[PDB]
Amino acid sequence: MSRLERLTSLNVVAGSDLRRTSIIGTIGPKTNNPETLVALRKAGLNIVRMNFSHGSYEYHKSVIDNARKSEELYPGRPLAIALDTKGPEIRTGTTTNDVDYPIPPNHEMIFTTDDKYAKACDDKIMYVDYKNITKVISAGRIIYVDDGVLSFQVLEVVDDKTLKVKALNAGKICSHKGVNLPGTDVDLPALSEKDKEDLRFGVKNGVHMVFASFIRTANDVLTIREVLGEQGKDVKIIVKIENQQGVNNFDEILKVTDGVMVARGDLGIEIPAPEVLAVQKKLIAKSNLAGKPVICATQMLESMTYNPRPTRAEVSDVGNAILDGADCVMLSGETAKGNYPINAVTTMAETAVIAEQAIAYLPNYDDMRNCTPKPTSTTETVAASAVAAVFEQKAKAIIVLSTSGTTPRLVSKYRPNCPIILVTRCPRAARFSHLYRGVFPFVFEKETDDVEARINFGIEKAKEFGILKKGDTYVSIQGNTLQVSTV
Amino acid sequence: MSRLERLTSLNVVAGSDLRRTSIIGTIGPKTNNPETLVALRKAGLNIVRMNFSHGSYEYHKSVIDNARKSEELYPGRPLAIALDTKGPEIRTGTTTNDVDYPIPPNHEMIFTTDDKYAKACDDKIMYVDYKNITKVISAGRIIYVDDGVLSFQVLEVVDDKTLKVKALNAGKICSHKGVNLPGTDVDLPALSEKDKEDLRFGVKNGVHMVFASFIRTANDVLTIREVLGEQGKDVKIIVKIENQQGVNNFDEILKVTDGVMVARGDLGIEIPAPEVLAVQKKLIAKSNLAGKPVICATQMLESMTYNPRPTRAEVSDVGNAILDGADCVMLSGETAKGNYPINAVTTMAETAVIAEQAIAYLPNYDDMRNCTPKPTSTTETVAASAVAAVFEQKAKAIIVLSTSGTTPRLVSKYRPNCPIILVTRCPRAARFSHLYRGVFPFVFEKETDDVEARINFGIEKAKEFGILKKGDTYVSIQGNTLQVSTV
Amino acid sequence: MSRLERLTSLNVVAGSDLRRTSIIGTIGPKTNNPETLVALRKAGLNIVRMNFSHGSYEYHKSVIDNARKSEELYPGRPLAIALDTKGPEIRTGTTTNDVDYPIPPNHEMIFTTDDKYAKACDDKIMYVDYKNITKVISAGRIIYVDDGVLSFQVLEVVDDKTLKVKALNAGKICSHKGVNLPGTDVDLPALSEKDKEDLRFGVKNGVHMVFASFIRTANDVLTIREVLGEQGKDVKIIVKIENQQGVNNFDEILKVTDGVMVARGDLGIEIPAPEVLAVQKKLIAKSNLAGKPVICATQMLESMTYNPRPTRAEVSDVGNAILDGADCVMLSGETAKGNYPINAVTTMAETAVIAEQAIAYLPNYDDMRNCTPKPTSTTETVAASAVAAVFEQKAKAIIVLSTSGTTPRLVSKYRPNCPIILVTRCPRAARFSHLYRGVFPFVFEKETDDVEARINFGIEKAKEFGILKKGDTYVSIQGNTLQVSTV
Amino acid sequence: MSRLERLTSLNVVAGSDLRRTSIIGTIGPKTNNPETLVALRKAGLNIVRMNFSHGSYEYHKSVIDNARKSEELYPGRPLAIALDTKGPEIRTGTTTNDVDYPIPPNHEMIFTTDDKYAKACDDKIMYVDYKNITKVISAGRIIYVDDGVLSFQVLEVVDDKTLKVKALNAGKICSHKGVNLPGTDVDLPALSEKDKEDLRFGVKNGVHMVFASFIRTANDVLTIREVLGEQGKDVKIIVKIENQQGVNNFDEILKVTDGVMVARGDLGIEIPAPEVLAVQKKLIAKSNLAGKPVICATQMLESMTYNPRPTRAEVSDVGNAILDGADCVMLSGETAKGNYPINAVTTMAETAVIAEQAIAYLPNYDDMRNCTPKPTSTTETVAASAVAAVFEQKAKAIIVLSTSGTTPRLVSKYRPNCPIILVTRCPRAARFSHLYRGVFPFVFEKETDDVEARINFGIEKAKEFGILKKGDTYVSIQGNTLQVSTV
Ligand SMILES: [K+]
Ligand SMILES: [K+]
Ligand SMILES: [K+]
Ligand SMILES: [K+]
Ligand SMILES: [Mn+2]
Ligand SMILES: [Mn+2]
Ligand SMILES: [Mn+2]
Ligand SMILES: [Mn+2]
């Protein structure tokens, strides 16, 4: 309980413990190649993310077999591919004479959705590819343009394709940039006709996850669940919370989803910037309770794109997201468009280890069990129980055999302060298990009087990582028993 | 105790409560003028900081009477001037043809301290104003240049003014930038012959604080205490921790000092970057226990220099520093060299209020009293006690009369979840009291059967801030009694 | 929190601390005289109790001026007289040839209420002074006789003055003993026509309390409150819980009452014996929360009537009642009919001191403030607050001036681990203040720039008790301020 | 943590839960016969105790096969026989003309150890069978005679067989009564030449325990361990703490022993009576930590010997001993010399159930694990762990297979709030397992792919006790795994 004595004792300096939080990294043209993909994975990259906001399936299919290629050149930790939906966003039209950039000072103008002005639009009018904004929008609303650099107080609603508006601030109007609707119930499908194809393209191409952008409600999840199809039942749906509709509803959404990602980016544009701080820790905490894998993402080491050294805020943000309960850390343009991607993963990583040597494992564990123990599913009771075991005997590991990634995810929920060695035969679960914090998957084959072998796989596999020293003390899990033998 | 239920309930959105954490802001040539100094103070600037690393006393004396000037144009909250020692640093020579910037790739070159190459130096040689590094330095050591963006494995020691070296990383060599000596006992004094003058200049000029850069030990503090002199007894010494010598000793230093500032900048260069995360919270926690005012500083909204919108890390770093116990938030180049200084204070501010509506006031309060209660100085017993009072009766304020800023600082230590109205006659204490988190000073004059008036000053003064609604409930403190009347 | 480490460290042996729990002692013919009344008071008797179940007003008026007489011979601690209502009970008739005691084995017989058999009754019939039982009673009901040593399954209802019955157990039938009706709504008033006189007699005679026997509901209290009258507003009503009607309603009763006494005796007859254990601690705990003075009573050192040494249970019951929160300990026949009354108070006493050196003052204090702090009456906020003060500075005392016994009772509620010196001018409050645990009243006369004197009364008065050593540390309370000066 | 809300919610009335604390009952001539021995066992008697302070081996061997006989007539719960050493006590000589009883008022006299006055002693002199008191005793010491009813200030030491003494109080000197030496290091062997025989007699006769009276040090235990011999390795040594030597050393003694009993009787004579209160809870708490079975004994329902109804103190002492952590409750003369032994066990029992519905199972559990978890033996880690399991899933039972009574004892240590069904093949462990609170042993025969049967023994055996309702939830333990299947 001595938070103050926990704090006053932080005893810094990254020690012997292996990083437990998986590092998600977006890939750009630069980073798309085995050699780099390797220096990246070696440095700490766990999962790879492909933003389907740009790029042809050629542009992407490339990335995959390249990662698959890095796996060939040197397997190391199993890597995971993940599709990131180009959700229902808003791209304004193009400026007439190409790159012409008229400059509104704080004047009145007019946005329209006619396409007649698509390629030919600027200063006087503006195109927006969301044919319905006129319905979902209302005079008084404030539209934002290009990373919310521009504001537009909705003055009126002309026609039903026309919108009288006024620049609330300066800047020059450019072409094709994202439009943000702060405080407007968008009816856009979380998934579009193309998105249905990108998913289907991913499923086919065997990507393990999906980060559905701009999720507003549970149905949206249910929808992307079936669109994924029977062949994609085994793939994870990582809801992306980046708007009010997605927060003023998170709870019912958290229910049906597999995971959740604090899509900081738009979220920070969508709602007030300062609000995030609380709207972040709140969703991670809520996630933790639900037991589902959460991910913090965007601008963590943003500056580490043009620079080799990250800032104070960035470092002291990577660590915090972990203290708040994040299961994974992301990297967007620091890997898909930056000069120092190797250092990126390398700084994130280094910070995660110091950020885990500060956690209050015992008390945090208790708090988590004092929430809805009544109950508790048998796998979760054994989950919590095993965790307690190590806290007592000071166990070093906690080998658990699985296929659904259920048993190791639950233990994860109970955040042990020792490696969670998951021995599995299913290759798929071993890849998407980097979603749950602290889980070190390994794939075992051949084929309950045989599980001792699998347990010897994880033990020896643990030994190679220097996690067990023999005559140590580990806890196993399987059918639902619970072991606690020695090395 | 329900940290999870505290977290899951965060209920964001900046509400009615007034910001309690004072905002420190460095001033640059741009920001130096009343009009701006006002828009700044209005937005939230509490204290002003002048980095004595550059600028003539003309360059500075200006800043002061300009702030004093903003006080004239419109007093608002009392403002505080603060000198920031140009500690014992090491600035490199200049590049020959002015701004010429040769680019080392990872080559061997040679640093020298001859001054014959001071103004004329680059690519082949390099000047350093620390004539002794040759002695304190040793082959194997790793020199850092400009925010440690560059590294230099000390290859050898040529002559005693020459040092064979190799760029451990890329970059282009520029002129006049700070040199960091990670792992080298520097023999330069926390205070120099000039520094003794800058302080004396400040004392004379009535600056309320001093942020001694590069403090290594307690003596250093004792020294700057006497250098300050009798006329400067009433001014605060805010130790700046930016090296290992300052951490591997913090505890004995904390003793004698008034405050402490996590000089993130060099500190992050001095010691490992990731290390800071823990080395930050640890020092703030230690400070809190000691009860002395701590300050977080540098790169909090760094990007908010070239941009109007801050990043995710930055926002979710301003708030965190406050959760970790910081009494004040700083702003370096976001005010002294940035394009959007008004937005800076304006974003910091907005975040601080959301960051204080997340704290666990009751439990944090308890934890703090369970550390060395034995005792406890009478002013601290009354301090803690009063705080408890408000926690029971749900008090809105806590008016305390003082002159030493002792009584209000201690209550501060016990972080009440309501405004701490300090009524005073001493103008000086009312200015430097923005050092202690949550204290809202006000100056009262004229001149114990009269304190009821001063208490009516704070109450009415509280009312103007909408802190009391009459028939509310407040707790007073004075001689040592403890009140608890109604409005 | 370390209950186990609190337990494992109990470090027994009555030490220096003065007993804080007042000792209530009933007086019998034997004990009625100054000399004895003194040896009793000297040994520890605080309050005296007169059971109005027997004795003429001559029989009683005697006791009073005899105690008043002991006060004369030697004042010592101020003593308090207390009337104990001869509540609506049911006494059985007398056995024919005087003390003849027929012995029923498990036979059928017949209870009647004819008075024709009052003085002449036994074996075949039995008299009961409750003329209505026939109505309120019903075949199947189980009557209890003399400390419920005998049981009587109501076989039938003969006539309306006759009741066919069967001894459910052995024993010999004697004369005049109390009859208990477990599970029968008795229509007799908490107060009777005579009781109204005994109270009025007591008020007149200046007895400070009243222990209303057999209270069933709040009205009963309200009734005895007005019966007491204007002249008896200043006297305390100590509800006696000895039936189901009184428990299945305690909460609404606790509201309006001043105190509450766990009338163990009948209560143990009324409801199951084992049930008491929980039905005891529950009512004391509930009392503590409400802040009203509770008293444990009956059979604590029962055997210490015929013997000089008490039993294990008795000793380890006197202490427990105190751990459970009792403000006072009683003595019935161990003082009003026993051979060793001096040893009784002397054993109770000795045990109370060991029983208070085992309490968890800090944690118990916290728990108490975390129940309805919202608020909290100003006198209670100052109450709780002062207590906290001593916990910090390790205060030895806590002098509080009062007249209502409000301020010292509330502090009491917050059970400080140091003497609560109440300085008063009202003699009455100083007598009934032995009701609140830990309060050491003292009477001060003459007659806010003077309270320093009264505070010097308590301090010096504290010194005579060796509670303060000068240069110690005490906390005062008065108008509502809160002091904390030194000795 | 809400002790107050735990207390305020006690919700009395013995409910559905089965008593978990075993009831130890001493047998007298009266109680020695199957019929009674049965009504006793049926009512709740778990273990039987034979005080070897009196009775011939004929007097005792009788008791055993009578209990063994009650087992025959109707097995019910397995019963356990236990020998209770006639430790090194002190019986004064006899009065000359037989029952002559001279009366000392407060005079000086003389105790001697010559035997010449053995049968012929009184008024002038006194015989004591402890030939060494003269050495171990010292002028100033205070001897006690017959239940400490008499005191004797050691005036001087005449000769080395003579002791000048003075009656510190009145009374008449009788023959053969126990002499107590408060504050005198007795060198008497905890075991005597005869005791060595009584044990050996017991071992042979297959009694499961031994309650060594008057233990002073660890050696004493070690001694009775070897005297017991190889054939008695499987029998339990229940140390009896009844003197200062045994408390001022408990910790080193607790080490090597199996159990511990708070021999209240002499202990209360040995040391101050009030002291016990703390010296009781302290030893039980210390026992709990050590994990060894503790027993509270003597005078719990003392009065329930001559009366059918117990007192308030007694009831509210039986329950308390259980709250303080006692694993077993005893009954001395309430069974071996009383008129109502059936009611005795029947009241104890009834109280134990209400006394277990008040415990704070969750918090008490935590506290226990936060003491020395480092560690922790694998059987204890699994022990603690399983307990936690039930707390989560709200398990009803916790079947554990054993032979050493190790696994079920440890779980016991972690006091689950559900029945601990121990399935065993060893008849001996099933009998002495009533030593550990909450354990419900059952014997299973025949003869790890078979343990499912034994688990089905306990489950079905649980069902007969109505502990499981099928589709409930239980936790198993065996080789060291840990199960958690359903019914
Ligand atoms: K996207
Ligand atoms: K500086
Ligand atoms: K009465
Ligand atoms: K014995
Ligand atoms: Mn987005
Ligand atoms: Mn610096
Ligand atoms: Mn009664
Ligand atoms: Mn004994």
Side-chain angles (χ1 to χ4, degrees), chain A residues 3 6 281-282 285 367 371, chain B residues 1-11 357-364:
Chain A
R3 167 211 194 233
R6 178 194 314 143
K281 321 161 112 337
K282 194 158 157 165
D367 201 3
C371 291
Chain B
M1 73 252 161
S2 350
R3 168 214 195 227
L4 261 297
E5 309 286 3
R6 176 195 315 143
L7 262 13
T8 309
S9 308
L10 252 4
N11 258 56
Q357 275 166 6
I359 305 184
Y361 287 94
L362 336 318
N364 273 343

Side-chain angles (χ1 to χ4, degrees), chain A residues 11 268-269 282 309 320, chain B residues 11 169 264 282 309 312 320:
Chain A
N11 255 64
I269 310 304
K282 194 158 157 165
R309 306 353 155 137
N320 267 121
Chain B
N11 258 56
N169 63 122
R264 266 150 155 223
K282 193 153 160 173
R309 236 177 121 137
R312 306 267 150 298
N320 267 121

Side-chain angles (χ1 to χ4, degrees), chain A residues 412-428:
Chain A
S412 201
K413 172 188 186 179
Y414 289 98
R415 229 65 91 169
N417 69 152
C418 78
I420 305 179
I421 318 292
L422 159 91
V423 173
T424 181
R425 297 189 121 89
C426 201
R428 217 190 222 295

Side-chain angles (χ1 to χ4, degrees), chain D residues 390-445 448-464:
Chain D
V390 6
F391 265 163
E392 295 292 312
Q393 272 234 84
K394 298 197 186 248
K396 309 308 217 66
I398 174 175
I399 301 134
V400 30
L401 297 71
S402 199
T403 319
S404 332
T406 298
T407 336
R409 168 180 54 99
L410 259 1
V411 174
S412 201
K413 172 188 186 179
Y414 289 98
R415 229 65 91 169
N417 69 152
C418 78
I420 305 179
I421 318 292
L422 159 91
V423 173
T424 181
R425 297 189 121 89
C426 201
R428 217 190 222 295
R431 317 204 107 66
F432 69 54
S433 255
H434 300 257
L435 247 190
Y436 327 127
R437 198 211 286 182
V439 180
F440 303 74
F442 281 93
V443 51
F444 175 83
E445 80 326 296
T448 310
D449 66 329
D450 92 317
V451 294
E452 301 59 55
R454 310 197 237 152
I455 300 176
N456 273 132
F457 188 52
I459 293 170
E460 187 179 37
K461 275 299 138 276
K463 281 167 156 183
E464 283 154 359

Side-chain angles (χ1 to χ4, degrees), chain A residues 327-348:
Chain A
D327 277 88
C328 304
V329 261
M330 191 145 106
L331 278 176
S332 296
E334 299 116 306
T335 303
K337 195 214 115 151
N339 276 255
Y340 312 112
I342 44 281
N343 302 175
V345 184
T346 298
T347 296
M348 190 151 255

Side-chain angles (χ1 to χ4, degrees), chain C residues 307-319:
Chain C
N307 282 97
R309 236 177 121 137
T311 26
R312 306 267 150 298
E314 307 191 308
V315 164
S316 257
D317 175 70
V318 168

